[PDB]
Amino acid sequence: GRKAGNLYINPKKLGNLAKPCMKEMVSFLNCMALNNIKDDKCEKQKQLLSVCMQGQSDHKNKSWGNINYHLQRLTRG
Amino acid sequence: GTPKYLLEPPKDELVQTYFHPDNMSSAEKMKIELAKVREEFKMSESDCGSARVQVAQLTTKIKHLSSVLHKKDKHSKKGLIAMVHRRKKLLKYMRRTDWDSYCLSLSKLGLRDNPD
């Protein structure tokens, strides 16, 4: 593991490794399971999956990982 | 502020029944009996810790415990054996220091003389 000493929290020890449009994907696959694998008459789930995809396109890869520097500078103070 | 029992006459026969030794636990009876034995053997009037007083009290406790203790109760039997060895040490002290009290205790409590 990590070397013991000072204070350290992981940048990935939060909710970060959950890429979106997962429940929308499994709901769309569920609708193909129910409606004998047709894209017809449940296009609402298709639209929600697509809008989730453009929402992922609007979103970007950001994570606040500068907490460790602030903890290290508060230790020195 | 007067309680309810301070209006009726007291009942003396029930108070006499209340303090009967049949209504006492075995530990209370042992306490009374050991106080009596200690009164019987004392050297001074406030004497409660001389060697012959301790010998008489230990003899009474040893005789009670050798009869009431269960065979499977090993933890209490270790304490009974400790009482036996304490009584030997006190008798050994009295045999070299106070020979008259040694003979007093051996005669009155019925103990053997074992100088070896």
């Binding site: - | 029930l14 029944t17 049949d22 209504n23």
Partner: protein, 101 residues
């Protein structure tokens, strides 16, 4: 020693059955050279679970308490209350210096 005899009756037992059992225990205490200092009724109580007997399941009960000065052997001599059909539970405890209200 001084004891509290707790008696949890079945809720269907009438006044006469309660009096009969309390008086039988009381005459048992007197015959062993004992004093009854106190008898009281806590009324009907609600139970924490459903006590199940051969009659069925009961969620109520009548609570009685007899305080006695009696022999040390009396908890052993009261084991006939384990086979008593008017009772849900019974318990003998050494008397405590606590106000029960």
């Amino acid at each position: 020693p001084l004891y509290d005899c707790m008696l949890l009756f079945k809720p269907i037992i009438r006044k006469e059955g309660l009096i009969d059992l309390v008086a039988r225990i009381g005459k048992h205490v007197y015959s062993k050279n004992g004093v009854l200092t106190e008898v009281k009724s806590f009324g009907k109580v609600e139970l924490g679970y459903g006590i199940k007997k051969l009659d069925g399941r009961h969620y109520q009960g009548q609570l009685m308490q007899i305080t006695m000065m009696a022999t040390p052997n009396i908890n052993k001599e009261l084991h006939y209350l384990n086979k008593d059909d008017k009772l849900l539970r019974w318990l003998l405890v050494k008397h405590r210096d606590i106000k029960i209200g």
